[model samples]
Target: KPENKLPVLDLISAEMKTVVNTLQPDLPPWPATGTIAEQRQYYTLERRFWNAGAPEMATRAYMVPTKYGQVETRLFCPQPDSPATLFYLHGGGFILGNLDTHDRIMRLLASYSQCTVIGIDYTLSPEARFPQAIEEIVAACCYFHQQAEDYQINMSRIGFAGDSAGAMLALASALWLRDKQIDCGKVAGVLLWYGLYGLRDSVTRRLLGGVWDGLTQQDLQMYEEAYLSNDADRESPYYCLFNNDLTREVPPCFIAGAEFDPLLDDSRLLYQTLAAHQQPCEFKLYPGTLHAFLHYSRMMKTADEALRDGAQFFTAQL
Candidate 1:
């Protein structure tokens, strides 16, 4: 049976227990405050423990020129002249994270699919809020589309992936592509892991999140406030992550989530929403796992399995 039916604590696996212990589930609550830099540093240090053993990659960094000035990006390749490209966004609740924090995830993704993975370092929130990061993502993707030949990338089949807040941006980029009628390139597939999908409140919000993943109700509110300017933004088609009309036209997407994440329902609801629209999509629930499990790939078999599954989807779709 699916683990969601059980009590939240009971759903955690032995591996997840190790994650809890390592991450300190009883740690103090989020500042949800302005210690943004300190929080970024803290998570970067925490992530170091799990970033080991990623495949050595043919990686190079570049600044992607956009209307929002220049965005930083690093492209990782398993080989020269890859046939397809995957644009990856790093998750940090919109207020945290950068290219370095998510380097290993990008490297593994690049190696597993044998495609060039360009990790886009979008500006964080409070500094760049709401549509700013979204706009930058669209701009960067368009830049790649125009310059596809130079990098030996296949513009016809582009893939997108992200975790947490980055997942929102990744999918929003796809939506922005379709909604704006931009014909630059086609999105072959999208992979989202435990993403925030404009949820204000839910059962999981009330009962599931905690220090294990730092997604308590207050924490979620803080993240939302950090990225969005007002309630009107929540109604936006790109921000909501679900729209029956525009969504059907987008490419196939794969959504995954941890069984014990407070945002667990967000993932499921989107899957259901897409399925109802008859959109091409698939969903995976990593039973006994919790949010941010992807960051623990070095030790948790589930994390690696999730990455492999996403790579498999990209391989077939792109």
Candidate 2:
């Protein structure tokens, strides 16, 4: 007999695509060039309203100093006594996102997981560059780990998570934190949603070639160029965690992928690498989805399903 239930993952991916198509913009053909500030303001307004529909309130918003500068963060606490906390980063190609863009999602994640969630406003690229963004993220993690009690959190149950470019930042921070010999037992796992771990092959680099629609190849290249400041830094784990040695030290990870996304193989390759090293890990792929599915939770059935799976995984592992 045929399988009775629908493929939960494929279903979710389809829903994600629906949401993305509905939410994505219909701009003119890909631009050859523009000021980073111009692109930032334009896209920030474009996606904020749709994202705000997720509606998560913040208990507080403040600045924490890192070597980079004063970075902003929004904290959401659902239950003071919850067992775990999440450090969530918002995705914007490492150049165009802020605290307000992800306000709703963080609130919902905190409520769902019944824990405190801290969303960071790391310095974006063009202004900050690749390793700089990585540095700020790692510093923020160190800051929070050092000051957990002050925030009324159980440091032992902390986890790092993010979507898209934010996921890239989160993984870099997590890798550095573990490699640098900081205590990570309080951290149960990482949730990498549509992460870009800086792998650009000939096929992968041309994944969206000639597409004059939303997020064209040109658009993605802009972010990648900003991320890779110089050829000497090409193997920097801060921009590409895949180059890191996972055989020795790393935490459990939950890596999520979108079937239709360009970063599908990034998650696949990383997951396989972690597994080869015998690190506790799980990677799930959703069908008919795109790069930004995490924020499309409302429109994509796949997003909510993936989130439920993510919640279940966090609950089980943590």
Candidate 3:
């Protein structure tokens, strides 16, 4: 059930419509039937459109070395940076989105929290693949910590935050750092806005039908296939958390899921898994929305509220 189905008069101010219009769901024709080459081209175009509108909003840009190559990044730092920092990754159905598309939302986060935000333009899937995306994220994270001084940031309370696929990448990176004992303690909190925990099985997929424009079971398969590109890579934890319990002293987690999202069950399942392992976590459902709604704080009332909630939760825990 949605928490608030109708757009509240108080919340839906004059600015809401503009933001809603920006995300009008007029995405270019789905590449469902396209050849692999066509899909790749389509992805690049989508990434450009998503970021083109936010060119002026970007504060600074840099590149961080990763296993694959240097991944470009944008930093949005609030005035007189706080002791904490947020390492943010953008989500584009796992294939699109760059520093620009996520600028507005990340700007709000940076300004509101008064913390330095390092946003990564990770390598996209069906092009770069699983470990590539994950490796870039992890390297950027470590680089951010090591270079905190250059950015006038405090390294102690660093945290990870991302939306959709980006959120999953952040989590996977944290897990990697934890396993290697590589300054994982710096990850004091994780702010995930409706991230897919993993690929859904048959029963879970069947249970979460395509009720809204949110994520769907079939979408999960598509994303998995695109990100993996082959069965040999299925063993990657970034692909599936098959063996691990996923709750080995992980930092506090704040997750928000839209009511109509197909990933709703997956998020719910992960929440329970966190609790089962006694991991500190706070989970909530936002009504009347679909997947990718969490970052619409520029227009939607709940979106802003969710972001604020995440900042507060992460700040408190850190």
Per-prediction TM-score, please?
0.92, 0.86, 0.81
Model 2: lDDT of residue 175: 85
Better of 1 and 2 by TM-score: 1
Residue-wise C-alpha lDDT for candidate 3, range 1-318, written one tens digit per residue:
233233232333344445535642545675768876576566555444433333233378888898798899887766664778788987877766677667767877776666778788888877887778878888887877787778666777778888888888777777777777898237888888877766556343554434234345556677778887678666667656534457677778887876655566667777888888899889998876656665556457777788888878877875
Please list all clashing residue pairs in model 1, or write none if there are none.
Answer: none
Model 3 reaches what TM-score against the true structure?
0.81
Off by over 4 Å in 2: 1-17, 20-33, 55-58, 202-218
Q: Indicate which candidate wins on lDDT.
A: 1
Clashes of 1: 0
- The Cα RMSD of model 3 versus the native structure comes to 5.3
Candidate 2 per-residue lDDT, tens place, 245-274, comes to 878667788999876565677888889999
Error of 2 at 44 (Å): 1.4
Q: Count the backbone clashes (under 3 Å) in each candidate.
A: 0, 5, 2
Q: Supply the TM-score for candidate 1.
A: 0.92
* Residue clash pairs of candidate 3: 3-287, 51-101
Q: RMSD, model 1, all Cα superposed? A: 3.5
